[model samples]
Structures are given as structure tokens and as C-alpha cells.
Target: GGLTDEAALSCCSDADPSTKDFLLQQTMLRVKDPKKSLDFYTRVLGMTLIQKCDFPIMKFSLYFLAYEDKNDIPKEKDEKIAWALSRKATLELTHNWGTEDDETQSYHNGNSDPRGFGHIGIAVPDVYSACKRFEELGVKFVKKPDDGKMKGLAFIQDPDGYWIEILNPNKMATL
Candidate 1:
């Protein structure tokens, strides 16, 4: 009651019973190569590939990943996929077969004309060090932590040129 910044404390409408069970379970992004994108998200960013579904008839595949690591994961194929879908905030990758071999094909990064999509973000502490590792790995850097006029932010481009925003969670609070 005694502090400033009224906008920070404003509340949106409360949820009703009908919408109470809603969860943003997953987000999907199209990728050119499963192998390359797999390396970038899993190896570089420390995510787990929870599920990979092959659609031979449709000539495509789906790779589901999440930031959270799994424990005592189900063994059977169907059981595993069910488990993956149950988790929230999954990052799913859709790969159309043969895109990796097609020299003229590249996915739209949603950055230019008719732009709507922006980026997926990753948060860590002391972002400078995190950005540094990305530098050492020679991954594409759209914006370094100290690059632009803005403070406490960095942007890394994935192999397919989708922007990945990087920031420190501790910037506005204690760790």
C-alpha cells in the first residue's frame, strides 16, 4: 500500500471453474533438420528429448523436448509418449522428412515480413557466463549480453535461425 508502480500490482480477471484445468502443455516449431536442431536444443541448451514420434506414412516426425529432466521414465513406447504429453511446457519440433537434404529449403524464423512469432526464452543466473559458453561453442549470436542499449539481455540464434532469448532470473530478484 505504501509502494510505487501501480501497474506492477494490477490484477487480471480471475479464472472461472470451466477454465480451471487449462494448461499450456506445449509449443511447436518447425525445423529443417531433426539432427541439427536436436543437437542445438538438447546439447547446447541442456534440454531432454522426452519423445520422438516417427510418422512414416505422413513422411514427417515429431520430437518433443522439455527443460525439466525426467526420472523413472516409462519404458514402453506408447507409455512413454503418454508421459511426454502429460507434462507441461513441452517444446515440440516437427520435421518433414528430406528437408535436411533439400538445399533450397529453410524455415521462416518469424523475424521479418509478415512477422508474428518471436522467440523461445531461456533463463539462467549470471547470464554473462551462459552467453560466454555459447560464444565458445561458436553458435550463432544474434545479440550478446552487452551488445545493444538494453541491459541484462542476450539473443542467440538456433541452427535454423530461430531466436532464443537469454536472460538472468536473478536480474530482478534474489536467487
Candidate 2:
């Protein structure tokens, strides 16, 4: 609301051109329990766990996930790493050792100040049906489609409190 014409022009004119060729690769986030996170991403969201790497010394495990099939994934470590890095989109879940054992251990969802990593959008074929299935599975909803003043959209929180935006391509026009 406060941007002048010159300010807006200056903002757009100073960006890096090299970013055009940069692929997203993956979005990394820490998780408290790898098993639960894996179940949420694979079983609930239908993403495949393409690669899982463990660092014993570092006491953490990295799980790389994508919508691609498991058969298409590379077998070798180096090749898999290279393949993962070359991908346009992926989700990396890092699980530190001993977090699963501790009942109180949890990771921040980053919805608040100082660490503001918001939710990720997951597109579905049918928003209403998908949301109903999610509800049947006992998934927690932060914002239901019928909630608030808005309609045709929904928000659900994972076991770790990270919000996932459930949306359908077809209902976007109604919103």
C-alpha cells in the first residue's frame, strides 16, 4: 500500500537473472519423528520416498520424497543424490536421532515469528472428496472449507503441526 512507482520499478529491476535456470531441487525441513513423517507424506499424501540417507556421526537421517515412482529412482548413492539434485521438486525430511524416543520432542511448524516457513499446497483431483477422506482418516483441519468467510478451500495440519493447503484445480474458479 506504500510502494511508489519508482520503488516498485526499482524492486523489479534489481533481481538476479541467473535464478531463471535454477531448479528448486527440494524443500528441506526438520521433523521430530521420521516414521510418522514418512507415513504422513507417503500414506496420507501419496508421495514416494525415493531416497533415505543416514548420517550416524551427525545423528540424523534424511528422507527424500517425490511424486515419482520408486522403480524410477536411482540405486546407487551417488547416482541417487545426483538424481535428487536434478529434480525440479522434492521434499526432504530430516530426523535427528533420539527425537522419536522422547515423547516431548517436537519440531516447530514455523507459523510464528523469527522462523516463518508457512504451509505447502497439495493439489488434489477433488477438494471436497479429498477433504472428506482426510476427515475420515482423523486428520486435523486448521481451516475447513466451510469455515471462516471463505469457501472452496481448506487447510489441514500434519501430526507435527505443519499446515498443508488442500486444493482442487476445478474449484479454483469458484474461489
Candidate 3:
């Protein structure tokens, strides 16, 4: 289908220069163990730990994250919007060390499935290259960049069974 005027506007408007700007950070995952999840996020996903601290009575820790800050955010308009709206420092991952009601909510670590809180998606410059990097690091790819139903996107899975959606971030698709 051809890009309609409205669709084009909607797509581009997200990065509209008139839009209100704000810090853009997404807290996508909630884990049971801060230390274990921290290890998985840092080692497997290659995410950097901006900071980790205990809440003491709350029995939890807050973790910050990012994909090296060099290539995580693309130069595309949407990504620019994402960056513009984001905190522009680091990705924050918080682990609420709370007790589960039963045995069902427990997963050994970040690689566990059969649990809720499905996945975390990121905007990468290149799916193939990113996937290659992940492959080298022993992280598995869930699929071959299907791009969901959008037809211009792709996806990958993190080491912790978290789903990542990658796309062109614009109407144009070159890769």
C-alpha cells in the first residue's frame, strides 16, 4: 500500500519539532532478583549497568541500562523523537525483590520463560548486524526479523527470553 498523507503525517509527526519534549526512558521489565537479573542484562544483552542500589526495606534495587550509547538510537526522525523524549542518559531497569504468592511466579533467572512480562524492544541501526553481534555473544535470535505485521520491521529475542522489535524507524526501508 502506498503511504497516505495522514499515515505519513502520523508517522512523521511523532518526531514533529512542535511536540513537547521530555526525558525518554522505558521501564520494561520487572524481575524478582536484582542481582541475577542484573547479571543477565549486563552479560547476555551486553547492557551496561548505569547504577545498582538497594532500597533496604523495599528489598529491591534499581538498575540503569543502555546498548553502549554509541549505536542504540538511530539518526532517523522517529528515533530522534525517541531520544528527544527520553532521559538521554541511561536505560533504567528496576528489580522489585518481592515475594511471589506461589511457586508459579518464580523464574530461575533472566533466561526463564513461562512467565509474564513478555519482552523488551529496542531500536537498532541494523537488525542483521545487531543480530550478528548478539549471536557472537551467545545470545539467541527468536526469529529472522519479521518486522511484525508492519512489513517494514524485524525482531530479535534477548538472552532472557525478552522480545525485541527492530525496524527502519521511517517510511523508507533501505536494509
Candidate 4:
């Protein structure tokens, strides 16, 4: 390894003021059917709608999802943008309006052997109640909490076959 590389990577005294303004606000994914995707997210995972907007020229629309409640969300579009940007937890579902009308063409949901993008994680308060509710809703489980050696965590699939890894940090840290 180059000594210069390690030197540059070492911690700096402080990031400048301008650098402090930047923050990670969202993670985006493409969904073939927004309706099913939206339903799975809201019904099973309990995510709330941040906003849904469309662009005419692109022939498409998008959905913004987060765990925040609808009660405090801004009423106006401009205020919503500001409210969204201020928070660090958000998921953006991009639906590109096009000719693929069926399952013949599907979006890439990465696999384990030859992995690309890893799945996102959601921490819960109780793993037992969470997985039980998933059972009641008929939510497809990728790996249930006790199925694998990672006993405190569970993985479930959304409508688009995207994995949401669930864990309860309150008790999971021991495992």
C-alpha cells in the first residue's frame, strides 16, 4: 500500500463550513408497477408517502417514501421539498414510463453470488411482532428472524423483490 494513500485518508481537523451543508437524504430504486410497490411499502412495511410527482417530457413519475408521519408533512409543494431535504431517511421510487408492460422485462434485484447493489436495512423495535405481522399480511419472507444464524434479523421482499433487512437493535446487538 502507498504511504501517501494512508496519510490522505487520515482524519482531518475539521470539514469546512461549506462541506457541512451536504447530507445524504434519499436512496432511489426503480419499480415496474408503482401501485403494487406502493401498497407493499405502505401496507407491510408501514412507510409513508412523502410525495409523488410526474414529469411530462420523460413520460414518467416518481414516488418519495419515508417513515415520517403525514400529520406534520408540509401542505405545499415548495414546503414539502424543504421538509424532505431536511431529513436523512427517505426512499425514492422512480417509475420510467415506457413500453415494458409485463414481467417479460423486470428491474434488476441483485443476487448474492454475483452481487451488485446490496439491499437497504430498517431497524425495528421488536423483531417478533414485526415478523408476525408480516406473516399475517402474507408478506414473502426472504429469511425469517430465526431461519438463519443471524437470529435477531429478518429479510423480507417488497413487490419489486427488493429486500428490506429488519433488525431490532435494542436486543440485536447482543447477537
Candidate 5:
């Protein structure tokens, strides 16, 4: 038996029932507009907003959203248990009160790859409908979700310019 770094290895490997006990959950993303983000996140994503409380010194509004039932998926398609169980992700919207230049110079350049990020993929029922809703809400999309295969892969810049991947899991697994 080779004794090595189990933590790092566990972090890297796929969290299957046999391979591991659990999976990743609760990813926190920063945003500029809390109310607006909440509106889109809850109303559009079909996610339930659990909490939106205040933090003392930080002056931040942390919002929690969850799909709740990964097991309650479509009967026509089968969704992996592991995938469904891992539907715990959170997005945090902060309000520092000031700093106009930071918003202008730092956020949403359409040039710079977010400091160190790829994108946050959101599962929607219909990409076309979702895009229409986003347009109605004035949500700016960097790239439309019209990829030949995946279909829904839009790069929507949040209020703070954070890149979020809005995608439809038509063919993909959804639970």
C-alpha cells in the first residue's frame, strides 16, 4: 500500500459513490448587484433562495440558492446520483458602497479573462427562452449560447462584470 497525500488526490478525483464519500458543493461568487442578481438567480434558474442575511463588519449580502432535489429529475432521462447530489452552489453579492473606477476599469473588459476563472455554468430549460428573458432584463451577454453541440453557452457579465456561463442541460444530465 503506497501512503501518499490523500487530501490532494481526493480533491482531484471524480467523487463517485465507490471512490469517495461526497462531492464539491457551495461555490461562492461575488457580484455587484445583490437585488438584481437575486432576481435573476431565483426567478430564472428555478432555484430557491434560502437566505439573504447581513454580515456585520464585511457589509455583504450572502444569498443561498439550491435546486433541492437532484433525485427528482425527468423520467425520460437518467441523471447520475453523484451529479444530482452535488447541486449545492452559492453566489454572493457584495456592496462596498464606493469605488466607481473599480467597477469601470476592473470589471467586464470583454478583453481580460476574469482574473482567474473560466465561467459559472447555469442549467436552464431552454437557452433561447433564457436568452430572451436575459435580453428583457437587460443582462449583457458576451457570447450567445448558440454553440453547435452544447447549444447553451452564453457568457453573461454580471453587475460586477463576473463571467457566468448560462447553459441549457437539454442533452446533459439534470437532476
Candidate 6:
């Protein structure tokens, strides 16, 4: 199911070398509710709410979040915006307007087969302790650490039913 080293390299051989020069700026996903998504990312996952922009006419809001310290972030207005925009890796949570107003306004998380968008991975310092804390926080678990054949690996579902893989980087292979 996985590609071999030669196969992976072959796939990229024909591509331009410059394609690999750019860094990943951000990955975006649509959330049903901004309040719920914001709280989950900031409080549970420990990400900083870097910037939030709103468009009244477009009726949508953009939230930029990252696992970075507030002090290390830029202070100047223009620089701050530029810094956030130029980030190598960041999560962009988009909330459409009127989602909270209507009870049926919902976005497909793309977790199901045929529309598969898989889960987002989050590397933690301690997998077992993190899962324990998530349980205490009343977070729903799609796969517990010891639930399946794999131990020390867990999956938790966000409010929008997006799966987040929690793993310890140092102990991943052993797990």
C-alpha cells in the first residue's frame, strides 16, 4: 500500500526542482461553527490564534492558527500580517456566514470514503498522557491508544468530526 523509495523518487524525477523549493504556507478546512472550532484548536490543541479576518459582504471569516509563542510573533501591524501569511506551516479555519444562524448549515468533513480527505496528524510529546488529558477534557476518541492493534497511537474527533492523529514522534516506530 505504501510507495517504495525508488517509486517515490521516480514520481518526482520528472517534476521541476523548483517545485520542492517552496514551503507549505497553510492548509485550510471549512468548519461548521467558528466558536467551536476556535475553542478546540486553541484550548485543546494549544495553538495560538494568530489572526482573524472577517468579510461582512462575503459573509465568511478566516482564522489563522499556529503552534507558536505570542512573544515570538511580530508586533508591527504590517509585519505581523506578513509573518502570518508567510508562515511555513499553519492551519487556516474558515467559517462560512450564517452557519451558526441556521441549524442545518453544516460542512462535510471529508472523512468518509469516496470523499476521503483523511485525518490531520499532530505530533505530541507524550501520546499516552495527551490522550488521558483529552479524555478528561471530554473530547471524543475515534481510536484510543490501546483500542486497535497499534498501541501508543490515538485518534480524536473534533467538533466537526475531523480526525486528528495523536502520536509521539520519538516513540512512533516502536508503537
Ranking by TM-score: 6, 1, 2, 4, 5, 3
lDDT of 2 by residue, 1-175 (tens): 8999999887785548987687778888888888888988888889998888889999999998889988888888899888876877898889899988889777888887647888888989887888888889888899998887767788998778898888888878876
lDDT: which is higher, 4 or 5? Answer: 4
TM-score per candidate: 0.88, 0.87, 0.54, 0.86, 0.57, 0.90
Q: Which stretches of candidate 3 lie over 4 Å from their true place?
A: 1-21, 67-86, 98-103, 106-119, 146-153, 168-172
Badly placed stretches (over 4 Å) of model 1 are: 1-11, 173-175
- List the pairs of residues colliding in candidate 6: none
1 against 2, candidate with superior lDDT: 1
lDDT of each: 0.87, 0.85, 0.57, 0.85, 0.60, 0.87
Model 5 — TM-score against the truth? 0.57
Which stretch of 10 consecutive residues in model 1 shows the poorest summed lDDT? 3-12
Clashes of 1: 0
Q: Tell me the tens digit of each residue's lDDT in model 1 across 67-126.
A: 765674678988998889888888999999999999999999898986989999888877
Stretches of candidate 4 exceeding 4 Å from the true structure = 1-16, 98-100, 112-114
TM-score of 6: 0.90
Estimate candidate 5's RMSD in Å: 10.0
Model 4 residue-pair collision total:
0
Candidate 5 clashing pairs? 145-153
Answer with 2 or 4, whichever has the higher TM-score.
2
Which residue ranges in model 5 land beyond 4 Å of their true spot?
Answer: 1-19, 69-87, 94-114, 147-152, 171-175
